[PDB]
Design an enzyme around this catalytic site. Sequence first.
Site, short mmCIF file in Angstrom:
data_model
loop_
_atom_site.label_atom_id
_atom_site.label_comp_id
_atom_site.label_asym_id
_atom_site.label_seq_id
_atom_site.Cartn_x
_atom_site.Cartn_y
_atom_site.Cartn_z
N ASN B 47 0.82 -1.19 0.00
CA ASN B 47 0.00 0.00 0.00
C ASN B 47 0.86 1.25 0.00
O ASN B 47 0.50 2.25 -0.61
CB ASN B 47 -0.92 0.02 1.22
N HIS B 52 -2.81 2.88 -2.30
CA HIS B 52 -4.06 2.22 -1.96
C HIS B 52 -4.78 1.54 -3.15
O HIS B 52 -5.41 0.50 -2.98
CB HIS B 52 -4.99 3.21 -1.24
N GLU B 82 -6.66 -7.37 5.19
CA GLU B 82 -6.17 -8.18 4.10
C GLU B 82 -6.27 -9.68 4.44
O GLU B 82 -5.44 -10.49 4.03
CB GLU B 82 -4.73 -7.77 3.75
#
Lengths: 164, 161
Positions: B47, B52, B82
């Site tokens: 990320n 993102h 996640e």
Amino acid sequence: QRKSLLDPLTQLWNRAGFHALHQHELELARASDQRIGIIYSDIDHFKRINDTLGHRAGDSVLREAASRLRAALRPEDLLARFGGEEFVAMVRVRETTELTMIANRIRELMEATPIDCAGTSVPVTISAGCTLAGSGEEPERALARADAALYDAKRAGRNRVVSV
Amino acid sequence: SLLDPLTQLWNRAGFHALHQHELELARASDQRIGIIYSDIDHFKRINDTLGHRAGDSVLREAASRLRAALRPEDLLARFGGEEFVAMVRVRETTELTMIANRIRELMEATPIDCAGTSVPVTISAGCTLAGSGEEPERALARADAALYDAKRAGRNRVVSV
Ligand SMILES: Nc1nc2c(ncn2[C@@H]2O[C@@H]3COP(=O)(O)O[C@H]4[C@@H](O)[C@H](n5cnc6c(=O)[nH]c(N)nc65)O[C@@H]4COP(=O)(O)O[C@H]3[C@H]2O)c(=O)[nH]1
Ligand SMILES: Nc1nc2c(ncn2[C@@H]2O[C@@H]3COP(=O)(O)O[C@H]4[C@@H](O)[C@H](n5cnc6c(=O)[nH]c(N)nc65)O[C@@H]4COP(=O)(O)O[C@H]3[C@H]2O)c(=O)[nH]1
């Protein structure tokens, strides 16, 4: 018990039992929106094994084959032995690509490991023909198309799968 | 509804809602409730180093590979973060372990395409069977803890518990 629907040697279905199971799979298949695939496979160079090492050796190869195959398929898949060195499977699937894949699976796993026959290790391969039962096609018809693909598989060199 | 918006997989709510039905099913076919709890390895690194949108893409490809790597009746969910939770009916934990390692392997077998950028990812998982009458949540926790051990051990690793 009325177990004349089995192959005595391998305990798989025999030609007769296998053919009787068809109709019910037609039911299930339309039911679950699936297709009926046939995989017809045959052990390569089986006489060579038999003539060379004797009937027990050959029966051993057949028994190890039946066992590997059975272990490489889901519980509801029909597996049969009609005679000689040939195993016929019937599987409910979505499309033929999946059938071929299952066929090469069996093929590779048969090739991957030799077979112990009384202390003598024997390498074996298998050829297969496979097809889907056509829309409104009768059972024997599809079986014969798969038998014919198997023939082509042998002719094309063996140890391979022919999807038709 | 009862879905994770991002991935269209079940969410924690959707998970628990199906459970009781899975019990009934497991009883019918003499099976056991298997839980595989998995988490993408080093997801913040992604990320941060790619944004993102990238992180969100990795999440999308995982849901897709996982989902394609199970049978239709197997429950696949994302509660958030996640992490992907799977529920699969089986007869013994070795089978659950194999399934877990299989998902792990295919996750590692191919980088994930992030719009002209293929990023290597790995996943870690903990798995367990649910005991008789056990609360789904208890089973959930046991697998979450094994997942944690899997992370602490070095990741890209399955811990069967
Ligand atoms: N009746 C029957 N059908 C079969 C058999 N093998 C494969 N299929 C069918 O072919 C589809 C694709 O199989 P896949 O490429 O192996 O891809 C599989 C595979 O990666 C994974 N996988 C699923 N179940 C098993 C399993 O019991 N063992 C292993 N090693 N992998 C599995 O799930 C994927 C797809 O699951 P499906 O939705 O079920 O989709 C399957 C499934 O409908 C079989 O021996 N018998
Ligand atoms: N609900 C669920 N159960 C799973 C899954 N994967 C594995 N299992 C279970 O684990 C047993 C053994 O799996 P296996 O070692 O891969 O050994 C398998 C595998 O070699 C073969 N195989 C069966 N279906 C597939 C498939 O769809 N794809 C592939 N590549 N192989 C399959 O059949 C053997 C045994 O089949 P099973 O009798 O069905 O028995 C299976 C099955 O009950 C899964 O994704 N979902």
